[PDB]
Every structure is written in C-alpha cells, then in structure tokens.
Tab-separated table of C-alpha atoms in Angstrom:
chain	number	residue	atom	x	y	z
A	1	UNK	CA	49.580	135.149	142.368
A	2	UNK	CA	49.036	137.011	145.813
A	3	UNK	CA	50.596	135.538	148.275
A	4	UNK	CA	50.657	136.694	151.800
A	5	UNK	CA	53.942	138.361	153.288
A	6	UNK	CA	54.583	137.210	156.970
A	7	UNK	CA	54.986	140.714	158.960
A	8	UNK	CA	55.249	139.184	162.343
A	9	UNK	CA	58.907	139.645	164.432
A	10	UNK	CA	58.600	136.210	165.614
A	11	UNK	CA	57.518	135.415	161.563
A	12	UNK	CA	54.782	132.651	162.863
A	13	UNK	CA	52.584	133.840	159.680
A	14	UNK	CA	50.258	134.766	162.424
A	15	UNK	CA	50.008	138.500	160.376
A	16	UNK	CA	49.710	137.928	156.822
A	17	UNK	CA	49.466	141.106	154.350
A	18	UNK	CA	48.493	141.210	150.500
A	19	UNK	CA	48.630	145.035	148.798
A	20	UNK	CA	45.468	145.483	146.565
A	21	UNK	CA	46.132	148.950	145.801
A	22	UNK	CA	49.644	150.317	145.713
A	23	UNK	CA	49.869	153.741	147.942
A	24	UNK	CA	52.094	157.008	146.886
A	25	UNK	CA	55.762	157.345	147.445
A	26	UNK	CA	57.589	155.079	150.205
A	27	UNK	CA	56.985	156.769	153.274
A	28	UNK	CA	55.622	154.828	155.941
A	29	UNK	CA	53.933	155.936	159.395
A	30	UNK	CA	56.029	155.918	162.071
A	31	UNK	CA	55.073	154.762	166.039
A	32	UNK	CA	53.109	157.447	167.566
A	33	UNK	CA	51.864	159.249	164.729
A	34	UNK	CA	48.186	159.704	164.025
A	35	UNK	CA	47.057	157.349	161.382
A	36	UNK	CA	43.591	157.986	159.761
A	37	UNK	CA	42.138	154.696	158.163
A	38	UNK	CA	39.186	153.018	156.918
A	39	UNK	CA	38.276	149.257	156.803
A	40	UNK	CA	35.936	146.388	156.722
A	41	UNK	CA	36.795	143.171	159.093
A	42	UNK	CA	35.589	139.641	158.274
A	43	UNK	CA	34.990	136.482	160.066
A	44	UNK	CA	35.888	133.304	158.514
A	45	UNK	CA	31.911	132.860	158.081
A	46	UNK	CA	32.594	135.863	155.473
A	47	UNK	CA	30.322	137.836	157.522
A	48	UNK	CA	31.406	141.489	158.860
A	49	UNK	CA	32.185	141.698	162.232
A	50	UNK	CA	33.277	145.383	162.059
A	51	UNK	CA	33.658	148.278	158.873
A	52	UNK	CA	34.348	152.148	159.389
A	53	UNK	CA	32.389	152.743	156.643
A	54	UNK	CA	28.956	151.051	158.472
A	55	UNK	CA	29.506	153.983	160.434
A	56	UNK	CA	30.568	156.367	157.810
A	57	UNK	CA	33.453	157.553	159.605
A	58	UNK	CA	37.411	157.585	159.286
A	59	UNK	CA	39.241	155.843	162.319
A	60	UNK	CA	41.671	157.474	164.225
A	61	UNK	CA	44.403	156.080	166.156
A	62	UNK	CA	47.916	156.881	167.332
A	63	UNK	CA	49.994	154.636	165.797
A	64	UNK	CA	52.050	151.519	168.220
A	65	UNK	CA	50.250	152.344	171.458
A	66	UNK	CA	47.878	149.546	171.966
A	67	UNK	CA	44.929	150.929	170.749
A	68	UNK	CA	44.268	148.543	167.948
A	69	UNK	CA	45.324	144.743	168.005
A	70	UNK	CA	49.004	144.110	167.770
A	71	UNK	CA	48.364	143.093	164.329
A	72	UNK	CA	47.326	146.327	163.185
A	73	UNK	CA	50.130	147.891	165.118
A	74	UNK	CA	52.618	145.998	163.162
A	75	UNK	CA	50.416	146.375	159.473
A	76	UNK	CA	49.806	149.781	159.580
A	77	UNK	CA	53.452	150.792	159.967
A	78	UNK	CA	54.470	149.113	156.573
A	79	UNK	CA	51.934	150.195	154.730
A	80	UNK	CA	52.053	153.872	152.108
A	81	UNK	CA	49.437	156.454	152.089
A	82	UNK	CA	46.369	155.306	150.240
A	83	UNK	CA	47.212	151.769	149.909
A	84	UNK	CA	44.322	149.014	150.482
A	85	UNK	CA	45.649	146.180	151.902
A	86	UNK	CA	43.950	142.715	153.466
A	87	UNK	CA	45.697	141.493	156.612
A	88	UNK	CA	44.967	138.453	158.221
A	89	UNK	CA	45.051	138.203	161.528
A	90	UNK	CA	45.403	135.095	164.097
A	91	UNK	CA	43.772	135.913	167.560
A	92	UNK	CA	47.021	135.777	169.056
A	93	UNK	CA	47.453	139.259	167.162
A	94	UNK	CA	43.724	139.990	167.581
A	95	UNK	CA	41.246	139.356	170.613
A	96	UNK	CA	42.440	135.666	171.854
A	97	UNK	CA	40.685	133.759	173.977
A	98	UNK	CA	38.870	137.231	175.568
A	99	UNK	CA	37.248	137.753	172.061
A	100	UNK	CA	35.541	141.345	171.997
A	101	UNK	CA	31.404	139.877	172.244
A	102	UNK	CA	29.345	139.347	171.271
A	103	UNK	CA	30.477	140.373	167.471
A	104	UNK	CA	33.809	139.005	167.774
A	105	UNK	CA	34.046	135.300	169.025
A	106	UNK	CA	36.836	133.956	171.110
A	107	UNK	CA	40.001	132.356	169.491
A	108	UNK	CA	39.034	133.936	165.831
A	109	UNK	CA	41.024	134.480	162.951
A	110	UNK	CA	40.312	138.481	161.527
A	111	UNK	CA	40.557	139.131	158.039
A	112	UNK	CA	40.639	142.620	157.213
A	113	UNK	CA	40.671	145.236	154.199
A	114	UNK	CA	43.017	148.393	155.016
A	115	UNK	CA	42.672	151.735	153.563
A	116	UNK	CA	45.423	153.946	154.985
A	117	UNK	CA	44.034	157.251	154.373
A	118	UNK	CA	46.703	159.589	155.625
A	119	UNK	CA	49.053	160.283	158.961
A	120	UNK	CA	50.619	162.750	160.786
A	121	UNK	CA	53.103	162.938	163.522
A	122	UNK	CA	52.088	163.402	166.821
C-alpha cells in the first residue's frame, strides 16, 4: 500500500510524495545547494508534458530559490541521494491559473517521477 505523504506546511495534500526507490544514507539537500535531478512530468491525460531524459540531460537547480515550482522546492529537500520518488502536484504548487503553454494547461494537477541524482552546497 503506497500512500501519499502530505509535505505541504499548510498540509492541504496539495504536495503528495510516494518513494519508489529508497536513496543512500539520510542526508537530505539543504536550501541553496545545487541539486542535480532527472524526471518525467505527467498530465492527468497520462501524457508527458515535460522529461529530462527527452532531452538527455541532468537538471540543475539551486535548491529553495524559485527556480522550480514551490512543490519541487519543498520535495526535493526531503528526499536522499538516488531516490525516485512521484510527487503530485496541485497548480497551486505548480503553474496556477498562468499555466506554462502551450504544454502545460492552466489550473493542472503535475504528476511527476523524481530521480535525485546528487547535490552539493553552494
């Protein structure tokens, strides 16, 4: 039974995380470090909106800055190097009502798959 742990402050299940692969040790990346990650993101169609690995490339991002949705943000920082997570995602964490078009529609729910590949401070 996987059921999906709330990670959201306000705990409005609007960030919901599963662990499909269990990472090494129990350190966690902390806000501003470099986090290096691949993933796929799904609509609710089951169709991919977005994947690193389309592109064949790691993603890079400094870690609590803004630079990804809030729900990665909050996900990424609880999860180990090389765990695979899913994490879904209510726009309110996401795009909202902006959306980012055309591939991601306004007021959509993400559901993604997390690989956290490895971090570093900054």
């Amino acid at each position: 039974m996987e059921q999906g742990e709330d990670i959201t402050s306000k705990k409005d299940r609007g960030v919901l995380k599963i662990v499909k692969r269990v990472g090494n040790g129990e350190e966690t990346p902390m806000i501003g470090d470099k986090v290096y990650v691949h993933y796929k993101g799904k609509l609710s169609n089951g169709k991919k909106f977005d994947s690193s690995h389309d592109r064949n490339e790691p993603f890079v991002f400094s870690l609590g800055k803004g630079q990804v949705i809030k729900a990665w943000d909050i996900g990424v920082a609880t999860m180990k190097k090389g765990e695979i997570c899913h994490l879904l995602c209510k726009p309110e964490y996401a795009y909202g009502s902006a959306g980012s078009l055309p591939g991601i529609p306004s007021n959509a729910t993400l559901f993604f798959e997390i690989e956290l590949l490895d971090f570093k401070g900054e």
